[PDB]
Design a protein around this nucleic acid. Structure first.
Length: 596
RNA sequence: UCCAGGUGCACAAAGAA
DNA sequence: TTCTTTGTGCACCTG
């Protein structure tokens, strides 16, 4: 009932000096060359695929096509996403079983199982360990993307941050027998570092922490201004402001690290007893005053504010700045708009001098990350009307809000989707459901909110553009699912794939249509379900044309038997936007190749 | 690499309308 | 028949 093989380097294991008696002695030559590869320091940067050629004897594979079939899996490992898997059958299907020395005298019925075991041994004892020996995987948190840095380069970066974290008394070694709550992880950031704790799995005390966080969040919501959702705040502010809107988004640098613990402790003590009792108040003060982490098998005390990665840090930091915001945001003039999501501030006002004061005001209290400041103030260097905030883009001139997409140049779009669930496993003989399951609404439901489809401040042009951009992501996930499945799947099951494609367009168009009518505003003029279908089809056309050759049969049924014209009553629209891939998605990379 | 919040969608059992 | 509670899981988003 096990169909998947995880590509994660965490699922590897150590290799013994000799090979288990279960397997063949041909893994001895693989093991011996593995240690010899580890003993020579690198005279130059290495290529994993080109270097595995010397640890694995061609003897194990025989013909070149067997060797190339195995290393296709290795290439997937070298360029993996988080939680990515492959079908286990890939390791033992379509091999030339009679063309290898070590399965010549063996029964034909059993050896497909034998090759599967031996391939697993190489992947788990040789392939993954040699990758981990040379590179450290870093998750960029832009989807499931993983980047591999030289571990030699990472250790040097880690040591420089570690010594600086000690020079400044942010990290102090303790001689006391405390036990650390987790391991300290130094995460590389552009021209910066982020120090986090990888909390140890503590399931026995998890419900207690959920109780503590819930108590804090109610203290927050009943004594602190819950003005409303960002949606209500923006719609109300835009409707009451006629003139040009000025605004700024500014990023606090290290909000958690600049929380002064003694101030936070006495905020916690000041909480009324009926909202939080004494034994829980003392626990939280003790918890945040003694933050111990393990680093290079030594124990250290984190001495700079709240420690990121701890379960309580998120709500306690939010509690700290809700108190700080409240004295300043209660002086807010009637004309202003203010919203804060953790460590990002969004402030708008018809008076530019009010906005300009806010920027310096925050810069005077907190340290600011200036590379992320976005504003339309003419006083600044590089003003712009479009401001990203909380996953959306706000246009201060047109008041239009639009979805934001973290798609850097050369980003592999497949990193944004999780196709493989190790907990529900799907047979390799059933690519039908694998594709159907991948067409699940939640992966894009954050682009289907009241922000994207309203007509109270958003024009019909923006609603269509939001829907089109969302359907581009759906089409890219469809392409990623096709590439994960076998090459034959497309033309044998073309009829099934078409029905899945057609059903997907209805469901997303119907979901968008229902969301639009519920949030009708003064600008809703006429959107028809057919027009939504046309936009969704064109989104698939723009994406499928990146591989016209493979998807031509699909592209032709779309043109031949689907209406691609778009009847929208709105006249200030631009139909050209729905004719090609948008600027964001045009430059995403769609081909997988090993770079290390 | 970790954590808290959210947006949802599915599911089933039970106990009512 | 249909709805409404309690769960469960799972895939995305925000910092």
């Amino acid at each position: 009932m096990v169909h998947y093989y995880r590509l994660s380097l965490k699922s590897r294991q150590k290799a013994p000096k000799i090979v288990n008696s279960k397997y063949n002695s041909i893994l001895n030559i693989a093991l011996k060359n593995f240690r010899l590869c580890k003993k020579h320091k690198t005279k130059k940067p290495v290529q994993i695929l080109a270097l595995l050629q010397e640890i694995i004897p061609k003897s194990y594979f025989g013909t070149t096509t067997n060797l190339k079939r195995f290393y296709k899996v290795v290439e997937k490992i070298l360029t993996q996403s988080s939680f990515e898997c492959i079908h286990l059958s890939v390791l033992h299907k379509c091999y030339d079983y009679d063309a290898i020395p070590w399965l010549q005298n063996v029964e034909p019925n059993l050896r497909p199982k034998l090759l599967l075991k031996h391939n697993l041994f190489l992947l788990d004892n040789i392939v993954k360990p040699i990758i981990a020996f040379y590179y450290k995987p870093i998750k960029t948190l832009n989807g499931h993307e993983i980047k591999f840095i030289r571990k030699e380069e990472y250790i040097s970066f880690e040591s420089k941050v570690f010594h600086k974290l000690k020079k400044m008394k942010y990290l102090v070694e303790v001689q006391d027998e405390v036990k650390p709550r987790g391991v300290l992880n130094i995460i590389p950031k552009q021209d910066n570092f982020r120090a986090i704790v990888s909390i140890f799995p503590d399931s026995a005390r998890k419900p207690f922490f959920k109780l503590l966080t819930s108590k804090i969040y109610k203290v927050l919501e009943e004594k602190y201004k819950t003005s409303g959702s960002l949606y209500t705040c923006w719609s109300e502010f835009t409707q009451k402001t006629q003139g040009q809107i000025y605004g700024i988004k500014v990023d606090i640098r290290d909000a958690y690290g600049n929380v002064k613990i003694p101030v936070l402790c006495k905020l916690i003590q000041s909480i009324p007893t009926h909202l939080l009792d004494s034994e829980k108040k003392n626990f939280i003060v003790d918890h945040i005053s003694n933050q111990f982490v393990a680093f290079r098998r030594k124990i250290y005390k984190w001495n700079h504010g709240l420690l990121q990665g701890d379960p309580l840090s998120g709500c306690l930091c939010e509690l700290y700045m809700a108190f700080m915001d409240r004295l300043y945001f209660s002086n807010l003039d009637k004309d202003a708009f203010i919203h804060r999501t953790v460590d990002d501030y969004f402030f708008c006002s018809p008076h530019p001098h009010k906005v300009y004061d806010f920027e310096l005001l925050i810069k005077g209290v907190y340290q600011v990350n200036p590379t992320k400041t976005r504003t339309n103030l003419p006083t600044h260097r590089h003003p712009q009307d479009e401001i990203p905030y909380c996953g959306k883009i706000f246009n201060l001139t047109t008041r239009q809000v639009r979805t934001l997409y973290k798609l850097p140049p050369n980003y592999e779009i497949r990193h944004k989707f999780k196709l493989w669930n190790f907990n529900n496993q799907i047979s390799d003989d059933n690519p039908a459901r694998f594709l159907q399951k991948a067409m699940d609404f939640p992966f894009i439901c954050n682009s289907f909110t009241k922000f994207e489809f309203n007509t109270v401040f958003n024009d019909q042009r923006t609603v269509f553009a939001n829907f089109y951009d969302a359907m581009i992501c759906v089409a890219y996930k469809f392409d990623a699912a096709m590439m994960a499945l076998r090459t034959s799947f497309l033309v044998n099951d073309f009829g099934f794939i078409w029905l899945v494609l057609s059903s997907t367009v209805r469901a997303y168009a119907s979901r968008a249509f229902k969301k639009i009518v519920t949030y009708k505003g003064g600008k809703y003029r006429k959107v028809t379900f057919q027009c939504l279908k046309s936009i969704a089809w064109r989104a698939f056309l723009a994406v499928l044309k990146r591989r016209t050759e493979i998807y031509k049969g699909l592209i032709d049924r779309i043109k031949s038997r689907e209406k691609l014209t778009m009847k929208f009553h709105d006249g200030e629209v631009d139909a050209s936007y729905f004719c090609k891939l948008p600027e964001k998605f045009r430059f995403v990379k769609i081909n997988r190749k090993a770079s290390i």
